[PDB]
Amino acid sequence: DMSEFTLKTRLLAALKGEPVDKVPVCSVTQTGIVELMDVVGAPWPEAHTNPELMAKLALANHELSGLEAVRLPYCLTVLVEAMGCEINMGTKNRQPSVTGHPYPKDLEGAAVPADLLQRGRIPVVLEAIKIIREKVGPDVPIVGGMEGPVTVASDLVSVKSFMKWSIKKTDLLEQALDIATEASIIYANAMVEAGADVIAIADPVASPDLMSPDSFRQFLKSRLQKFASSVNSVTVLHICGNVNPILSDMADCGFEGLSVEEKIGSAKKGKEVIGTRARLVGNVSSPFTLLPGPVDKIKAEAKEALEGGIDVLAPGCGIAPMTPLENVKALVAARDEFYA
């Protein structure tokens, strides 16, 4: 059976810690790059709103790069926009970002709407998953990406209020977190229904760079656990920054895989504190290695990750849009060279 893996079965097995023939190489974070936008005719920002173009751009960084999955969409704003956040849609090389927060003072009116799945670009993402499945077939995995519940709550109330309430109005923090989690689960299961094989949430606001490890444990962990156990899929939890102080807690959250940056140090250092509770995904620096290169540095840092027991070889965060195609190929070549 070790000789019969598909790209899909290898990723799922790897994330679950089952035996595999080799470590898979892919990205669970955003994969839109300028060089590919130009090659296949699917540039931002149009690729965020047109499902066919969203599909094409995502496909390109599988077919033309060798990454062993397809990942969509390209931003952390689809769900929060659907929940009332105002968004700036960015540019050809700048991601959409949140500019307006609907609930900076109180949660009056914040309930999750019955028509959530019809709002904003949620229908675009769901359709793009179906289109991508058509284009790659059943044996290549589709990773559905989204902002996580902590980041959703914070986007809804503004990060200033979120941080303030964490100390001074913890009941409101919790209410915001519960609404955010409920909406996140509904969206994540919708993506599973549409064809996603893995749901990979990115929750930067849960990072120790922004929230204390103690507040992670006290308030955030239980919602991340509720998310993982309510979503009917293998899941991955991505949190950037130096997450070492919460890495064990991340490993308790019910996600099969933990996606981390280079800021944890070597993959081995991470493996040594999570044991068999969760698998590790990463961790080659997106801005400081994949973006500038050189190819040889990408490969060396990738090989260190593999030697340290990384379960899925991946960029540490979103691929920087100006990343050359050749640098993405380098990540794949490193895995291939590793197995001789």
Ligand X SMILES: O=S(=O)(O)CCS
**Binding site membership for Mg(2+): which residues?**
311
Residue whose C-alpha is closest to residue 239's, from 211, 205, 284: 205
Beta bridge partners of 257: 236, 279
**Which residue carries 């081995």 as its tokens?**
268
Nearer to ligand X, 30 or 154 (CB): 30
- 127-186 residues in contact with ligand X (CB under 6 A) are none
Per-residue b or e along 131-166, where b marks 16 or more CB atoms closer than 10 Å to that residue's CB: bbbeebeeebbbbbbbbbbbbbbbbbbbbebbbebb
Nearer to ligand X, 30 or 184 (CB): 30
User: Which residue ranges are tagged as binding site?
Assistant: 30, 95, 238, 240, 311, 317
Binding string, residues 276-315; x marks residues near ligand X by CB under 6 A: ----------------------------------------
Taking the complex as a whole, how short is the minimal distance between the CB of residue 60 and ligand X, in angstroms? 16
Q: Which does 75 bind (CB under 5 to 8 A by kind): ligand X, Zn ion, none?
A: ligand X
Nearer to ligand X, 85 or 172 (CB): 85
**Which residue carries 């090659």 as its tokens?**
39
Cβ–Cβ < 8 Å for 248, 241: no
Taking the complex as a whole, how short is the minimal distance between the CB of residue 317 and Zn ion, in angstroms? 4
- Residue 129: left if φ>0, alpha if ψ -120 to 50, beta else—which one? alpha
Taking the complex as a whole, how short is the minimal distance between the CB of residue 206 and ligand X, in angstroms? 10
Taking the complex as a whole, how short is the minimal distance between the CB of residue 106 and Zn ion, in angstroms? 30
Q: How far apart (Å, rounded) are the C-alpha atoms in residues 57 and 38?
A: 9
Residue whose C-alpha is closest to residue 136's, from 67, 78, 227: 67
Nearer to Zn ion, 150 or 317 (CB): 317
Angle subtended by helix axes 221-230 and 149-157, to nearest 10: 120
Task: Examine residue 199 and tell whether it contacts ligand X (CB under 6 A).
Answer: no
Nearer to Zn ion, 60 or 237 (CB): 237
Q: Which does 328 bind (CB under 5 to 8 A by kind): ligand X, Zn ion, none?
A: none
Taking the complex as a whole, how short is the minimal distance between the CB of residue 55 and ligand X, in angstroms? 17
Site residues for Zn ion per CB under 5 A: 240, 317
For residue 214, count CB atoms less than 10 angstroms from its CB and return exposed for 0-12, middle for 13-18, buried for 19 or more.
Answer: exposed
- Of 20, 29, 37, 177, the one binding ligand X (CB under 6 A) is 29
Residue whose C-alpha is closest to residue 7's, from 21, 18, 17, 193: 21
Beta bridge partners of 259: 238, 281
Cβ–Cβ < 8 Å for 304, 267: yes
CB-closest chain residue to ligand X: 318
Task: Examine residue 61 and tell whether it contacts ligand X (CB under 6 A).
Answer: no
Q: How far apart (Å, rounded) are the C-alpha atoms in residues 23 and 336?
A: 9
- Of 318, 321, 328, 331, the one binding ligand X (CB under 6 A) is 318
Q: How far apart (Å, rounded) are the C-alpha atoms in residues 233 and 121?
A: 22
- Of 30, 233, 285, 289, the one binding ligand X (CB under 6 A) is 30
Nearer to ligand X, 77 or 110 (CB): 77
Taking the complex as a whole, how short is the minimal distance between the CB of residue 340 and ligand X, in angstroms? 32
- Of 126, 240, 305, 331, the one binding ligand X (CB under 6 A) is 240
Taking the complex as a whole, how short is the minimal distance between the CB of residue 96 and ligand X, in angstroms? 9
Residues that bind ligand X (CB under 6 A): 29-30, 75-76, 202, 204, 240, 317-318
